[PDB]
Structures are given as structure tokens and as C-alpha cells.
Symmetry: D4
Subunit: 150 residues, 8 copies
């Protein structure tokens, strides 16, 4: 990757429906070169794909939660817990972090009941779980994971 690729990415991260002609004009380079570079980037796996950004509200995803999960130590309990957490419907993010040396789980649901039946009940039944603490998100000030280049 070079300076050029960055500018391309800085644009595609925001809007992938920006016609080549428009991008070519902005960064001032041959449309055929651009097309080539974009292919290169995908080939190499820099650009892993293109997604539609859907508004969660539009799907009535009102119950937003961030849960910290502490795992029981020993055997392979840790790694196993992470994967079990990542497959729960509604969970889009699972991170293993230092500090509380545990998992941080991001999930979304339409209501409390859905949350309870799909997430909580499942979680409370997992043996490797020592403890879980759920923080209800009451306001999303910002959520732009797509923005990787500032």
C-alpha cells in the first residue's frame, strides 16, 4: 500500500457507491489505474468487502447492551467461552481484554424480553462463566466502526 491507496480507502470507508469517475476526479488518476488498485486491495485482503449500513432503529433494535464477562480459570475454559459468546444471536462484538482480564460483549435486541431469552438466559447457563455484568446503553453518541482512516 502507498499514499494513493490510502486516499482511495479514506473515501471507500465512507461511501462505496462513489462512481469510479468521481473518485478518479477527486484523487486525480486514471480510472483504469483506480479500478486496478481497488482490485489489488481486495485481492490482498485490505478491503474485505462492501456492506450496507443499516440503521438499527429502523429494525427496532432498542435494547443495546455492553456486557463484561469473567471466565473461570483453568483448562481451556477461556478460549471456549469466547467462541460460545460470539455465536449468540444479537452479539456483534466479543473482545478479550486486559485489566479485568475478561470479555467485553456487544449486543443488540429489540426489547428487554428478547435480550433476556436470547442473551441472558444463554449466558447464565454457560458453566465457564464466573460472572457477567451488563451495562445498558442509553445513548449512542457515536458508532462509526467503518472509519479506520482519520
Amino acid at each position: 500500500m502507498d499514499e494513493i491507496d490510502l486516499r482511495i480507502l479514506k473515501i471507500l470507508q465512507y461511501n462505496a457507491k462513489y462512481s469510479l469517475d468521481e473518485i478518479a476526479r477527486e484523487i486525480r488518476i486514471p480510472k483504469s489505474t483506480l479500478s486496478y488498485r481497488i482490485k489489488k486491495l481486495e485481492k490482498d485482503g485490505v478491503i474485505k468487502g462492501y456492506y450496507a449500513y443499516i440503521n438499527p432503529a429502523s429494525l427496532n433494535l432498542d435494547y443495546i447492551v455492553i456486557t463484561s464477562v469473567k471466565a473461570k480459570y483453568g483448562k481451556n475454559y477461556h478460549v471456549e467461552l469466547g467462541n460460545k459468546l460470539a455465536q449468540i444471536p444479537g452479539v456483534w462484538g466479543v473482545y478479550f481484554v486486559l485489566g479485568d482480564n475478561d470479555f467485553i460483549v456487544m449486543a443488540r435486541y429489540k426489547t428487554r424480553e428478547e435480550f433476556m431469552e436470547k442473551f441472558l438466559e444463554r449466558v447464565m447457563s454457560i458453566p465457564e462463566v464466573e460472572r457477567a455484568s451488563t451495562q445498558v446503553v442509553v445513548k449512542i453518541i457515536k458508532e462509526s466502526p467503518n472509519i479506520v482512516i482519520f
Copy 2:
């Protein structure tokens, strides 16, 4: 929105570069109808946009952090702190949550130094900040915010 729109969205959330002809075939509907519905969805704001999914590693974003920030109570300190946190370069997520009744901030950087100079030093200088606790992410088990329909 109806059952049909969902199926369309369930596909566009994963891959927006799926030609209409291919989608039309999968959900079995006229390509012109599909195109219409997709336009409708954008018009109404269900689909807010299309992004390129860029691999963070490809940009050497190695220092991943999740920080909890407690704000000083009173005046308008809270709301103000959230916005100041959302404009720090590298920060893609800011949530106000219950429980610790504070902010959860998601950010990414290439290194510790970058993290320190761009995020920490800035944060430690904000007056409204009572306390901040940063959790270093050592492993991303899953990060698919794009998946809103399971």
C-alpha cells in the same frame, strides 16, 4: 418495511456488491421491483449508506482499546464530555451506559505512543473527566457491527 425488505437487507448487510440479478434470483422477485424497494429503503433512511469493510491490521491498527470514563456531575458536564470524546481521532464508538453510569469509548491506534499522544493525553486534560479506565484488547473474537439481522 415488510418480510421482503428484510430478506433484501439480510443480504445487503453482508455483501452490497451482490448484483441485482443475483439478489432478484435468490429472493425470487422482479429486478425492477428489487431496485425500487432498495431505493425506497435508502429514501426512508433504513439503508443509510454503503461502506468498504477495511481490515484494521492492513492499516497496522494494533493498539485496540476500550475505555470507561466517569464524568463529574453537575451543569451540562455529562453531555459535553460525550461530544468531546466522540471527536478524538481514533475513537469510533462512544456510548453512555447505566450501571457505572458513565461512557464506554472504543478506539484504535497503530501503537502505544500514538494511543498516548492522541487519546490519553487528550483525555487526561479534559476537566469534566472524573476518572478513566482503559482496557487493552488483546484479542478480537468477533467484530461484525454490520450484522443487524440474524
Copy 3:
């Protein structure tokens, strides 16, 4: 339910011994209509019943406690713990909450000894209990659960 029912409820929540004639006069409607609506409300279960508000002091309920209980994860331990907690004499409130993802138990007793023998000893013997933390209430600034309409 309509605007009218609300006004009726806003009155019955405070004082259920308010003669129909008096209520009819306040909200200005036929006493027979009122009587009908009140019946409707009970029928439908909006009004689940009428109680006598007894002063706890009058019964020497001096030892007031609020206990947080953490449950051991797995099996059905959680749901089971809640019900065991709800049947302890003296306990009038059991809530399963997020954050500490545990139970909050409200209870009243005449003395420390009663508290110990009826609540604590029972609680400490429950297997599913991981930990319990009791907060002694030294002052009730307000306790009006009956007020549902402000």
C-alpha cells in the same frame, strides 16, 4: 383505558375510601358511569386490589434491609435462587437487575436477631448464593410504591 380512567386511578391510588359521590363530583361524571368504569378496571386487572396501608413502625419493624445477592452461574441456579429469596418471611421485594447482574432483596424485621434468624441464616445456607451484601436502611426518606401516576 382513557383519560377518564387515569383521573379515577390517580385518586384511588391515594385513597380508595373516597366515596363514589365524592369522586363523581371531582371528575364530574355520573356516579353510575364511575362505578361501571371502576368495575371495568378491576375486571381487566388494571386495579388488582385494595389494601390497607399499615405503618411499619406501628408493628415495630425497625430493622430495614436492602440486600444484593450474587448467584452462582449455570444450570437453572438463577431462577431458582430468585424464588427461594421471595419466600423468605419478611421479604417483600425481589428484583433481578442488570449491572451487578444479580438480585436486590427488600426486607423488614423488628430486630437484628429476627433479621439474623429469619433472613441471614436462611440466605447463608442457600447453595446457589455466591455472595450477599446487606445494606441497613437508617432512614426512609420516601416509600410510596402505591403512587404509580404522577
Copy 4:
């Protein structure tokens, strides 16, 4: 108060619409005596009143919260904070407790937004508040404050 008064209270705490004739029959005493005793109890303030028990769901009170509030020490900050908390619409319970030596606040709202605008924003603006931690109630296993005699 004597053994008799207790039996009367043990009944009125559950259902105050139980005709004198029915109560008189249960406890086996003259209806005129009963009526006298009940008056005595009210006179003396044992029975402070009769309320209608309204189902919160019936009023769409879905967002149930239990908040711990720590106050800034000094002056009269403490006592003042308690009263300010007790007058927030939606708050039915305020207790000053030992342990975390702070306040426990019980409140109910129809939604998150209502909760935010009526409770949180108000609370975050109170100067005497050092910190507040809100626990969202996801399940009410039991709530019978009316039951004072077991």
C-alpha cells in the same frame, strides 16, 4: 394493639374490600367491635390509609430502575440530596443506607427516554451528587410492600 388487632390487620393488608360481616365471621367477633377497633387503628395511625393496587404494566411502566447515589460530604449536602431525590417524578422510594453509606432510589418509567429526561438528566444536574449507579430491573420476582405481617 393486641392479638385481635393483628388478625384484623393481617386481613386488611391483603384485601381492604372484605366486608365487615366477612371479617367478623373469620375472626369471630361482634361486627360493631370490629368496626370500633378498625376506627381505633386509624385514629392511632396504625392504618394510615387504604389504596388501590394498580398494575404498573397496565400503565406501561416498563423501565424499572434502582439507583445508588453517593453524596458529596459536608455542610448539609446529604439531607438536602435525599429530599431532592424524593421529589423527582417517577421516584417512589428513597432510602439512606449504611455500607455504601449512600441513597438507594426506586423509580419507574414507561420508557428509556422518559427515564433519561425525567430522572437521569435531573440527577446528573444535582451538585451534591458525587456519583450515581443505575441498575435496570429486568424482572420483578416479587413486589408486595403491603404485606407487613407474615
Copy 5:
């Protein structure tokens, strides 16, 4: 007990070697009456005994500790843990408290090593112990348990 007994106790709590003649003079009562009352108090168990107040430093008791111990719930673990803690040489105080709903243990030793071998190693070997947290006392601002009447 009456007003007189109090004055007697308020003196004996400070200095038990105060001749009857001196006390009799201070509270102005017959020495024979005093002697009688003091006997009464012992008889009834108000005065459980007379001790020599020994300076801990004089015995090189330099390592002063206050330890909080959390017990594993269930069976009779709790009560059993308390008694095991009360028999450890060096431990003069064991309290079961609310809040952290655990034990607070007061002990004294001449050195760190003594502390380790007599207290810690013993404690760490007790099964019923979930966790222990020792707070080293660096300064005794006041220690007058003998003063019960202010």
C-alpha cells in the same frame, strides 16, 4: 441499674484501683453502700472483671492488622469460620458484619514473620475462606475499648 451505678461504672472503667474511700467521696455515698453496689454489679454481670491494661509496645507488638474475611456460602461454613478465626493466637477481635457480609478480624504480632506463620498461613489453609484482605495498621490514633460510658 440506676444513676448511681453509672457514676460508679464511669469511674471503674477508667481506673479500678481507685480506693473505695476515694470513690465514696467523689460520688458522695456511704463506703458500705458503694461496696454493696459494686458487688451487686459483679453479681449481675455488669462488671465482668478487672484487667491490667498492658501497653502492646512494651511487648513489641509492632505488626498490627485488621483483616476482612469473606466466607464460602452454604452448610454451616459461616459460623464455623468465625470460631476458627477466634482461636488463632494473636487474634483479639472477630466481628461478623453487614455490608461486605463477612468477618472483620483484629490481631497483633511482634513482626511480619510471626504474623505470616501464626495468622496468614493458618488463614490461607482454612477451606471455608473465600477471600481475605489484610489492612496493616500504621498508626493507632485511639484504642480505648474499656470506655463504654462517655
Copy 6:
């Protein structure tokens, strides 16, 4: 101090009303020598005094508390807070400890109200107090501060 003095102290710590003749017989030494040594010990300050051990219950000291107090840092706030805490009526013990690097305060009162008016209200008014956490003692398994030699 020598081996002999210890044996003397090991006895006087338990019961100071043990006639010289009895002690002389137990440790097998001349009564005049004993009397001399005891004087020496007092002279040198090993034995600081003799107290009457009064049963707290006998004085209706039912509300027993152990409070942790965190002080605001800076100036001389710390040392000042300790002394203010040591002069509150009912407080018999004040320790400055490491770990939570704060104060541990032991106090006794007859009731909750007394506790509130004499201890809490006073404490909450002290400026240097950052935070206080009171643990109610529900059971004294052991309290023998007089025993310094095991």
C-alpha cells in the same frame, strides 16, 4: 522485663483482682518480690492501668459499627481527620491503615438514632472526609483486647 514479668502479666491481663498471695503461689516467688516487680512494671509503663471490664449489653450498647473513612488528600487533612474522629463520643478505636490507606473507626451506641445523631451526622459534616462506609456488626464472636500475651 524477664520471663518472670511475663507470667505476672499473663495473669494480670485476665484478672487484676487476683490477690498477691495467690499470684505469689502460682509463679512461686516471694510476695514482696512480686509486689516490687508489679510496681516496677507500672513505673516503667508496661502496665498503664487497671480497668473494670463492663459488659456493653448491660449498658444497652446494641448498635455496634465499624466504619472505613477515606480522607481528602493534601495539606494536613489526614492527621486532622484522625483526631476529629477520635473525639466523637461512642468512638473507642481509630486506626490509620494501609491498603485502602484510610481510617477504620470502631464505635458503639444504644440505638440507630443515637448512632445517626452522634456519629453519622457529625462524620458527614467533616470536610476532610472524602467518603465513609459503615459496617454494622451483627455478631461479636470475640472481643478481648485485654489479652496481649497468648
Copy 7:
């Protein structure tokens, strides 16, 4: 050891490559005496050895961590855990401390991955480990363990 030995040590702790002639001149004593004393010190074990102070950065030791480890109580679990922690490659410091009554482990690694594979995975597999909390060091303000005499 005497005043002289101290001055010698105060120099050797900083720079052991300081020729005898130079030291002899600084402390003003016969070079043969100095040489003798230094030998004495080693003989007696005051000086346990001489090391080369290597800059960690020079070895790309970028991932610096400080981990608190809580051990499961009972048997000999504690002592055993300490030794297992002290033999993990990268760990240069293991301390058993009071307060959290646990272990504090100091370690260094070149990267996150190394840290994970050599330290974390090993630690998470140890049975006696109740919980571990890793604090990432982002800045070393000072690290001069060699300085024992100020």
C-alpha cells in the same frame, strides 16, 4: 558493616566499573583496605554480585505488564502458585502482598502475542488461580532497583 562500607556500596550500586584507585581517592582510604572490605562484603553476602544493566528497549521489550493474581484458598495452593508464577519466562518479579492479599507479577515481552503465548495462556491454565488482572505499563517514569542507598 560500618559507615565506610556504606560509602563503598553507595558507589558500587551506581557503577561497579569504577577502578579501585578512583574509589580509594573518593572515600580517601588505602586501596588495599578498600579491596579487603569489598571482598568482605561479598564474602558476607552484602554484595551478591555484579550485573550489566541492559536497556530493555535495546531488546525490543515493548510490552511491559504488572499483573495482580488472586489465589484459591486452602491446602498449599498459595505457596505453590507463587513458585509457578516465578518460573514463567519473562517474569522478573513476584511479590506476595497484603491488602488484596495476593501476588503482584512483573514481566516484560517484545509484543502482545509473545505476552499472550508465554504469560497469559500459561497463567489462565493454572488451577490455583482464582483471578488475574493485568495492567499494561505505558510509561516507565523510573526503574532503578539497583539503588538501595539514597
Copy 8:
């Protein structure tokens, strides 16, 4: 640096008094080459110096402490606090860490009093200090900071 330099360092980190002839023999290289490389390493700053390893006990450094210090946010308070902490006599280590986002301070003293007068009193007087928590080290299982190559 190359493979050779490592072997040299792996030896000098343990014992710097190992004659060149001995090292030359172990790693099998010309003594003149070795001498050259060692000079290179110092020149480049890989080897920053040679120290005498002094046994702390030999200096009666019995009171070993590890203190966590939280700083007040804002201005330049943080950076300033670190430097003030690094200049306190007895302090050999100051680290700024994530998690509790604070300072970890390592210090040694001969006694509690020294600790109090030199470290604590100084620390409690620093304004930028929000809170400090000292953990007394009761056992050093391992302390070999000199070992950088395993």
C-alpha cells in the same frame, strides 16, 4: 546486534565479573573480538552500565511496599505527579499503567516509621493525588530485574 551479542549479554546480565578469557572460551570467539563487541554495545547504549547487586536485607530494608496512586485529571497534573513520585527517597520504580489508569510505585524502607515519614506523609501532601493504596509486600518470591534475556 546479532546472535553473538545476545550470548554475550545473556552472560553479562548474570555476572559482569566474568573475565573475558572465560567468556571468550564459553562463546568460542577471539578475546579481542569480544572486547570490541562489548565496547560497541556500551557505545550504542545496549549496556548502559554495570552495577553491584546489593542484598536489601543487608541494609535492613524490611518494609517493602507497592503503592497504586490515582491522579486528579486535568492540566498537566498527571505528568507532574509521576515526577514528584519518582524523586521520593526510597522509591526505585514508578510506572504509569492502563486499567486503573494510574501510577504503580515501588519503594523500600527499613521500618514502618521511615516509610511513614519519607513516603506516606510526602504522598498525602501532594495535591494532584486523588487517592493512594499501599500494598505491603510480605514475601519476595522473586526479584531479578537484571534478567532481560531468558
